[PDB]
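Throughout our pipeline, every protein is held as a single compact record rather than as scattered files. Nothing more is needed to write down the fold, since each code stands for a local backbone conformation. The record that follows is passed on verbatim for readers who wish to inspect the format.
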Amino acid sequence: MVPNVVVTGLTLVCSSAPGPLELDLTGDLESFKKQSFVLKEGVEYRIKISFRVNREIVSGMKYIQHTYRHGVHIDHTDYMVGSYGPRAEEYEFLTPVEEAPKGMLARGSYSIKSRFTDDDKTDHLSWEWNLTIKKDW
């Protein structure tokens, strides 16, 4: 009954953001639905998922993200994360560089449905968060 994978954080890594953009996924996941990260339009960023493995090697780990606008499904990306052995120290998975969309028509809030899984389709963690694209920070 000790969970094999504990997903601990999501971080938006953006060198031009004025402050830290982090979710503690060991907390109240419902609260994130009430919050949002602001990204300046057009900026480069990466998504960092922090997690721990406790007992057994996990293979074919995968990070799945669905993006919604106005409740309408507009993007789905899957990222292969890899294989990881148990240890005390957190692992950090980083996506490739992504770009915030740009232009008046792309500005506003988007809802993100995230899932961390593997080749067994285990629901290691599923959570929801929001991203708001603005002209400036």
